[PDB]
Design a protein around this ligand. Sequence first.
Ligand SMILES: C[S@@+](CC[C@H](N)C(=O)[O-])C[C@H]1O[C@@H](n2cnc3c(N)ncnc32)[C@H](O)[C@@H]1O
Ligand SMILES: [Zn+2]
Lengths: 43, 426, 147, 214, 130, 58, 65, 200, 232, 143
Amino acid sequence: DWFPEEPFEAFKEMRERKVFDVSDMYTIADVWGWTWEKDFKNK
Amino acid sequence: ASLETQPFPLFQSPASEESELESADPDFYKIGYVRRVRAYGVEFKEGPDGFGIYASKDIEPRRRARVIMEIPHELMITIRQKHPWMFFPDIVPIGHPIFDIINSTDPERDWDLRLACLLLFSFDREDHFWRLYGDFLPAADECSSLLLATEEDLAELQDPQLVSTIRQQQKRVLEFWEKNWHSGVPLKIKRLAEDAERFIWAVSIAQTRCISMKTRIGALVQDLNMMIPYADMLNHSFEPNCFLHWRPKDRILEVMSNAGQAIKKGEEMTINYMPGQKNNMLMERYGFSTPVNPWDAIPFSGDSRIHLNSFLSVFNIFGLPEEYYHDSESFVDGAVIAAARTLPTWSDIDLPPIPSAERKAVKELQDECRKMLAEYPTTSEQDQKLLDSLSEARTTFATAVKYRMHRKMFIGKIIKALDIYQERLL
Amino acid sequence: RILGIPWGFLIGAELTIVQSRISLVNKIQKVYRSQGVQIHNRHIEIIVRQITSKVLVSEEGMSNVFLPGELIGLLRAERTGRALEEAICYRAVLLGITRASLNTQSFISEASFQETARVLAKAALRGRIDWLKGLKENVVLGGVIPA
Amino acid sequence: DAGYLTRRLVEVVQHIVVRRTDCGTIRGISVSPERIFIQTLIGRVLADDIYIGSRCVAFRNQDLGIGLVNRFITFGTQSISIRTPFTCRSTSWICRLCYGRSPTHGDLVELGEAVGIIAGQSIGEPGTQLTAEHVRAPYNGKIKFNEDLVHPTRTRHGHPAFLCYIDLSVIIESEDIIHSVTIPPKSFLLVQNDQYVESEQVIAEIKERVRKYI
Amino acid sequence: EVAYATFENMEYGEDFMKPDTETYNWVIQAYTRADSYDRVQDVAELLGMMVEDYKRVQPNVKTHALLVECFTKYCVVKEAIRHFRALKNFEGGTKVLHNAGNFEDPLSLYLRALCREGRIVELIDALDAM
Amino acid sequence: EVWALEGFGVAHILQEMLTYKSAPESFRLLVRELRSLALELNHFLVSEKNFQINRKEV
Amino acid sequence: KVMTMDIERLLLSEDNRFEFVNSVAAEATEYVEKNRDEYGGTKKAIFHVLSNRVNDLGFDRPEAY
Amino acid sequence: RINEDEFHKISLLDCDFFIRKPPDPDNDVYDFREMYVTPPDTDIYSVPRVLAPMPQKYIRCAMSDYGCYDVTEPPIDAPRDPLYKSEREISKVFLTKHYRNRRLNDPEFVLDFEEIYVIDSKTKSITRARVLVTVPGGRKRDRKDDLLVIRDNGNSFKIIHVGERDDPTTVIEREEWTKTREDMEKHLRKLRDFSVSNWF
Amino acid sequence: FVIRGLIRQHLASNIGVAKSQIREKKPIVWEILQEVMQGHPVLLNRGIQSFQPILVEGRTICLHPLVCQMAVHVPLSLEAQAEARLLMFSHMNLLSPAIGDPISVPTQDMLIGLYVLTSGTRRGICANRYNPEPFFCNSYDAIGAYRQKRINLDSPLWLRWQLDQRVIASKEVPIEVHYESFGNYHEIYAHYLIVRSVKKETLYIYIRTTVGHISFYREIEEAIQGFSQACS
Amino acid sequence: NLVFHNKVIDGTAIKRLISRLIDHFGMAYTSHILDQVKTLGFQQATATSISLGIDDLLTIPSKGWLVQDAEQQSLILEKHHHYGNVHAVEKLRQSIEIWYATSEYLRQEMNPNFRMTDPFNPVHMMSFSGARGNASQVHQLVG
Ligand SMILES: C[S@@+](CC[C@H](N)C(=O)[O-])C[C@H]1O[C@@H](n2cnc3c(N)ncnc32)[C@H](O)[C@@H]1O
Ligand SMILES: [Zn+2]
């Protein structure tokens, strides 16, 4: 058994094996509601 | 003896018509003993009020609680209390129509219908222990649960709110049977309850025998509603000498005699089915009442009030309101504890009771109780007469009479309590 | 490149570490199984959990929170990657057995294993606290074993 | 070698003790498709429920008994998700659910059990123990086959032989009946169209680089 | 360590004893006021755990104040500015971060950090928040 | 044998076998020799009640 | 002979083997503190604790069987 | 579809047969026309494969099962699951006519082994047994002394005199001998000398 | 502990007198040593496991074959003695933890003894020279006939298996059945016989077995009964 | 409780039995059951005997023919090696492989030979039950 060499297929395996999924991809600006930080970081 | 069919409880004891605790048929214990049930120091006895557990030996007090019975999980029936339905004896095959029927129950309103479905299926599943045990369950004519009553009984119940709740229960059960035992169901469902009477019986048994506990099944801590074929023969008491307990390593339900309590040969081993429920709740679910019910209530509306603490001390009642108990230190019983929980009462940090105004309040509340008794067409002892002699032992009717009688007897004990309280306040 | 600095390190560690765990559990247990000396995977998986426990902070991960070359647990790296913007970067490392010991926080479990003088020298310069837990570091002190 | 391995493994895992009941992990290792599929499941606990259609068949933190695994492989429920030690939220201790059934009891592993050092021993001590088919004539008789169907070759032993890449039927005209043998493709038939053959005689056969000195 | 032992008792206990926001505040306070060692990695771990608890735990005034205290007592100003920019939204947040002027003075330490690191466009915002 | 005894969790037997059957005096030797290498192996225990840092007899 | 079945029964009773054995050690040391009869000959405090506990389970075993 | 209130539920391993029955106090009589077969509880019906002429008249039969036992010997979970299970697996059933349709209590009650109907679970089928009679007397012989032997997975039927009945011991011995003789020949045949050897 | 015992019996007034009596090795010293050893476990160390010692004749330590220069250790404290007795006994550790594999399984002579015990009958060609057995009403009658040399360990016999549940089988259909005209029939199998009738019921199973197989089953059933005798 | 076996106790079969006993009863019963089965085994071993004799060992009868076969081929190849038809590596590989082939066959035909033609042979029972002597060691005595 191996995860695919291609990163995108490896992400598809990450979903299918539920080792990592988008619901775990969260950070404070998305969690404590710091909606203002969008306006600061990228400028 | 791991076979045979049709063992039965000898009906010599339910022959009270002409006018008491013979041993249950030895096969009743044997079918358990062959299946790792153990009874320690107790005997099944068969009165006209059905089975009971009675101590067959004097049991000395012990430092920990002492085991009196062991029932193995394999003989039980279980439903999960919460929505994701699972069966831990797992009788029901995957994809059996029973799972579709049981899912069509309300998660919390219809747990009795679910248990009734399991009970019936366990009478259909050959060489399940309840295939043999079902003969010892009370038949539809001898079960006390008012789900088997009719208006002929509920007119004698004289408790319109409880009559309405019983009627709603019966309606719910019969509507469920009509919905889920229609002619389109498979034979392997239609044969479970080919008539309404079989289902209402099964529901009445499920209600009157449902224990519920938090348990551990291996790793899984979970809430179960369950039937235990020898702990359900314990009779109710609000002063129980035993309690149920769970061992998860070997999946045993123990029945444990209380720590530090001695018990006597012929003493009934009892448990506290549901702690803190009024007699009308015991009639609603289990189908019985008891006059010493220490949580019963009375619809007083008087501004007359009695000094609660003095009412306690005159009867040597002790503990907090959730805790009230009586000691050796003799008419004081659960009905007087109910009185202390129920009478219109006042309390103050240290202030003494007015010896006159408390007698005035006694007189006023006694005349209130007398008019409450006067709201019934008959006294208590007329129902005592209607129970010491009775036409046909119609179990639902006799249960309704026992209910009414208990309530009147109670209010009578209230009168006597206020009298003795005034006299003993000196 | 594909997931950028906030997530590419974290999920790259995750994918590396899970792939490594699968590979080590296979390659190790395949020996025992092919030799017929059967063993339950739950015994191998504790060792493989230790081998894959850490990640290292790379040079581009230089921060006032973590210095480059520092070894931190995967949970620590994930949680700080979620929490902080302080240029966090790390890569998974397969810490061999003889390097999982000598990187086990109870310094007595390191010193009494190997490289004793080097362990003691570093830990004394670091003033390190062995908050006594685990067994090897407790039997030296003649304790009741925190187990 | 075994003694060194045991010492190192125990020294690595001297600290893994079952300190907690439940670390509260919300994830599991997925398992899916056979004896290995059994052994990898038995005595684990599930990280998530399993349902067969609407029929709930297993629930979160339930133990996997053999009957449940049998149901899973019967009904094809892939994605069986189990709380392996990789699923745990601590690297410095383990919680009993993520370890599962005790090494020596039917119930969960026990709080305080040194499952680390138990694992280290249970892997180190077994280290002390680690360390073509020939088709033969089942009968006396006369070999018969069409030797034009098969390629000539020189055997590894210098013997001439036939090398075949077909299903070849070889007759053995025995003293009682015409017995027969099937020879697979990619095999060296050592015998020939009319050879007398004796019972148990080999009839067919189905790195380092080293100097040899003459 | 004696506070984190209780926190580790709670976070891996039954649901009725799981940490709340105050539990995180008290353990972050324990780390940020430790006498003798570097605790930044521990505070960042605890913050990450608090974010992992997002379904149950949300921060309060004291949480952000303690985090600005941490990320200014240690020179972590790029994260301090962010936690102060969150603290701004709570009335009296700067009173809490002034902490009555004891345990040094996290607000003063923050203003000094912004001064010497030249983050004046953040410093004027801290002054407006005060 | 230490590994086996601690595998059984039978740790009071392990304590007996490693201490009073022969801090323990051999840990006193250990700390004294490190203290002779000019390293202070300092043993503290923290009062759960009072947080007092009691220095062990070493 | 039989006493180990009682041990197993009590091991089956208690929810943690190590906690059970801790409680037995505690009971024995408090016994040998609350009573100062020598009680060290043919019968032993451990067996006494096991006997009393199995008697609480209701089983007819004498002190140290 | 069809109700079972007047059908014999002949439960085999792989299916239940439903055989219509007339009312009789002993439930002893079979229609042998209204034949149905049903998966073990599926409550679905079809006409089974009748492979032989069958009596279009109500007649009374004994019934018996040619089932094997099987030791299910399941895996056992922690709550003292039983370390054995053994269950009857009715691979086949025999229905044996009563002579003159005599009732079980009649003094001259005899099984009419001439008329055996065989129900097969796996071919879902009915057959009439082609029994062979070894007894001197044809149809007018004394049927009290007849003994039926059934053999070859219930494919072979032989009526033999009661006295002849081989003992169970010599039956098992003869089956073991006829097995081990072929196994021993199959082993010895690999030797060179087998062509020039005697059974001895 | 011997000194403490001599104090307990008041047979020595001081520890020096106790040591002097121990030096004198009089029978009293061995009686008190038997009192001390009663109920005191000891550890044996090769590999480290604990046992109840019993005072034995000779000079070399005697060990059970399935538990088998062993070293010996005494647990001194009461807590240690409790932990030894309740955790460190072979009773507590019958499984090897690596997969949960039983350690103490019968091995060496016993296993091959059991093999011969369970080899039982010679079959077929090994038993009769040409192509073409007592009944015992219970197993104690069969064992009695064996003891009285009426039958040999290897020889086939029929036992009435009146516990007619739990019949073992190989998924094999009846090798033969005999039906009597009166509706009794006998089913004959390679291992057992069943007599049953269309009227009445099953009378009995008869299992074709050996004194060896009977003894193998009986001695396990009687070991379960002998253990559970204390359940009374 | 337990099923009547009426079948021979293989080592795998008794491993199954003991494991199932531990799982059913726990340690309490099984530690006595197994300790009594010890005594049963000793009793029956003592009443029997597992003695080994010079003709209790049992060389597979066709070994001589097989050896003659492998001998004749080797002689012919050695002859043809002298003739320069076969080079030293082929001769070496024959000398290894034909005798390895024969040794393996001799082992694969040792157990069937015992079980069919001398079931109660000492070293047969020893190896097939697994008491002492692996099948390789018995073969190195016998074959
Ligand atoms: C748990 S069920 C026990 C079944 C009952 N022993 C029988 O004979 O079926 C409780 C039933 O016992 C009776 N019962 C319960 N509590 C009682 C009490 N305190 N006094 C008298 N009978 C009682 C009622 O008939 C009730 O339906
Ligand atoms: Zn965990």
